[PDB]
Each structure stands twice: as structure tokens, then as C-alpha cells.
Enzyme design. Structure first.
Site, mmCIF file in Angstrom:
data_model
loop_
_atom_site.group_PDB
_atom_site.id
_atom_site.type_symbol
_atom_site.label_atom_id
_atom_site.label_comp_id
_atom_site.label_asym_id
_atom_site.label_seq_id
_atom_site.Cartn_x
_atom_site.Cartn_y
_atom_site.Cartn_z
ATOM 1 N N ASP A 35 0.829 -1.200 0.000
ATOM 2 C CA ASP A 35 0.000 0.000 0.000
ATOM 3 C C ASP A 35 0.867 1.255 0.000
ATOM 4 O OD1 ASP A 35 -1.956 1.900 0.317
ATOM 5 O OD2 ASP A 35 -2.437 1.383 2.408
ATOM 6 N N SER A 199 -0.672 15.662 -11.923
ATOM 7 C CA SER A 199 -0.926 15.306 -13.309
ATOM 8 C C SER A 199 -1.176 16.575 -14.113
ATOM 9 C CB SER A 199 -2.138 14.379 -13.381
ATOM 10 O OG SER A 199 -2.533 14.148 -14.712
#
EC number: 3.4.23.22
Length: 330
Positions: A35, A199
Site C-alpha cells: 500500500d 498530473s
């Protein structure tokens, strides 16, 4: 040193991936959920409330000659999906894919929430976010990656998740045969303890690319892709019959649909998520309403590039002094 381990989806929907991890001496092999959005290595164990264990493999520290109670240490964690777990702490030898760390904090669960109990395939979590998020008190502990870092050939790990197929986690090297083209690297902020990046935009299907900054985290422990409501609305508007359902808990779409791809930007590069990756199947057995793999982050407080996004790429988690993230197509 390096390590290399295969990671395998837990079910036919790629809801999560498990990777075998050797703990203790002699080795006890547990299948852990790696994770990158948390920083605790915790396991089902011989200390876990018996009614909360349902088919998991447990770690038994009393059977490990290298286990040592970390006296006074406790831990307690809550995840973004509302699940939780807590317990005490041992140090022991932990190996992943041939890479060995001695003195790793292995957090033994005394209690786990129902979602963990009900998932027989996940024996615990191995956190790969920054150690500043580790929940051990009163002495915060380091992640497996942090402990391994100095011994690694290069201070990196890579995630190469499969679509309905096994993939790989590598530690300490970049497998140049595992991706196509070049790797595009992008800046990381560790301010919140995550692999947080920005992004450069998105496209829906064959649509034009929208240049826009989307801050979010690369999180292998989250199944879906969670993005701003504007972006998600633009995606689902291209699927006839799709709608957001408060009763179901997100966007659903007719199972008869053909889903468009979704592209996200990494610098000037583009990662394309095929439409099939966005299908999470019937909302309930036999239903003709299917659950979408792109959902709104509104009310999460953060955008999350989860498995839906990450499995479309070869992803480099660069833990050099100035961390960065790299994405390549594959």
C-alpha cells in the site's frame, strides 16, 4: 541488494493485489497488500481477536526465533475507506522477493474491522508511503522500504500491476524490459506523507486533451481512480445511461456499454487507461447496472491515482533524497 516479488489480484475484479512476504525465523509466509498510501506493516496474528479472523494466515511471533516484542509500542490506523486495525508491535526479519530487512517493525493486530475479517485473501498490509505516516506510538517506526533503502542498489521500488493478471513489485532496480518507450519523471511532495504529484491533465476516449493540474496521490492500496467531480462528470457523460447513484455510492453504467478510455498526463507524456479497466462489473450479482472505476474524489479531500490508473503503467517510486515518481507505458 534487490528484491523482486510477484503480486496477484485477489479476485476477478482486481479489487486489490497480494504479494507474499516472509516474516520471522523459520519463515512464515503471509500474503500482504502493498500500500503506497500508508506506512504501517501490519499482520493478522496469533494475537488477533479470534472472532475477527476468518481464513487469513496469521503471524505467530512466539514461533519465530528472531521476533522481539517492541516493549510499550502500540499502533492504530484508519484508512480512507473507513476500515481500521490496531495492536502491538514486534521486530522481526522480513523478506520480500529475496530482499531481507532485519529489525523490521511488524505490527501485530489485536483488532481488525469487519472489512478485513471478511477478506480472507489479505493477511495484512505492507505500507510504502513515507515513514512520517507510520502510526506506532510512542516511537514511530520505519517502513520496509525505508529500512531497506541504504542496502538497495538504487533507492527505488517499482509497481507493475496487472490487469486481470499477476504483476511485479521490484526493489532496488528498474527492469528496463518491463515497459515500453521512456519513463517520464515528475515531482513529488512529501508534505502529507504520500507519493503526491500533479498530473498535467486528461482526455476522455479519443477526445482532445485538457491541460489542467490535478494534484493527487499514487496509491496502490486504493482500487479505483478518484478525480475531481468536473473530470469524472466529463468522463461519464460519454457513456449512454451512466449516472451517479447516491444509493449505490457512485457512478454506475449499463453493463451493455462499451466504455471509453481515459488518458492522464504525466508531464508531456500520456498514460492511457483502456475502457475495460474502468469496468467493475455488476453492482450486485445478476444486476445489469455496473460499477464505474472512475469516481469523484469530492468529500475524500484528495485525488487518488489508485490501481485503475497505476495498472495502466510501469510506475517508479524514487526514494532518493528528493523523491520523484516515474510513469511509463507498457
Amino acid at each position: 541488494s534487490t528484491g523482486s516479488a510477484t503480486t496477484t489480484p485477489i479476485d476477478s475484479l482486481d479489487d486489490a493485489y497480494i504479494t507474499p512476504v516472509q516474516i520471522g525465523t523459520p519463515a512464515q509466509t503471509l500474503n500482504l497488500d502493498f500500500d503506497t498510501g500508508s506506512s504501517d506493516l501490519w499482520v493478522f496474528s496469533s494475537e488477533t481477536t479470534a472472532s475477527e479472523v476468518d481464513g487469513q494466515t496469521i503471524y505467530t511471533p512466539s514461533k519465530s526465533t528472531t521476533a522481539k516484542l517492541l516493549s510499550g509500542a502500540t499502533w492504530s490506523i484508519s484508512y480512507g475507506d473507513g476500515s481500521s486495525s490496531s495492536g502491538d508491535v514486534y521486530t522481526d526479519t522480513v523478506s520480500v522477493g529475496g530482499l531481507t530487512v532485519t529489525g523490521q517493525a511488524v505490527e501485530s493486530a489485536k483488532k481488525v474491522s469487519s472489512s478485513f475479517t471478511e477478506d480472507s485473501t489479505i493477511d495484512g498490509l505492507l505500507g510504502l508511503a513515507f515513514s512520517t505516516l507510520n502510526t506506532v506510538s510512542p516511537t514511530q517506526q520505519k517502513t520496509f522500504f525505508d529500512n531497506a533503502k541504504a542496502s538497495l542498489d538504487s533507492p527505488v521500488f517499482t509497481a507493475d500491476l496487472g490487469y486481470h493478471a499477476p504483476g511485479t513489485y521490484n526493489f532496488g532496480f528498474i527492469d528496463t524490459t518491463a515497459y515500453t518507450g521512456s519513463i517520464t519523471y515528475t515531482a513529488v511532495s512529501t508534505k502529507q506523507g504520500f507519493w503526491e504529484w500533479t498530473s498535467t491533465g486528461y482526455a476522455v476516449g479519443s477526445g482532445t486533451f485538457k491541460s489542467t493540474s490535478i494534484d493527487g496521490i499514487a496509491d496502490t492500496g486504493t482500487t479505483l481512480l478518484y478525480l475531481p467531480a468536473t473530470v469524472v462528470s466529463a468522463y461519464w457523460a460519454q457513456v449512454s445511461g451512466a449516472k451517479s447513484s447516491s444509493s449505490v455510492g457512485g457512478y454506475v453504467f449499463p453493463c451493455s456499454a462499451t466504455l471509453p478510455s481515459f488518458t492522464f498526463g504525466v508531464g508531456s507524456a500520456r498514460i492511457v487507461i483502456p475502457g475495460d479497466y474502468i469496468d467493475f462489473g455488476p453492482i450486485s450479482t445478476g444486476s445489469s447496472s455496473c460499477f464505474g472505476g472512475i469516481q469523484s474524489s469530492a468529500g475524500i479531500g484528495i485525488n487518488i491515482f489508485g490501481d485503475v490508473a497505476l495498472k495502466a503503467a510501469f510506475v517508479v517510486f524514487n526514494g532518493a533524497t528528493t523523491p520523484t515518481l516515474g510513469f511509463a507505458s507498457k
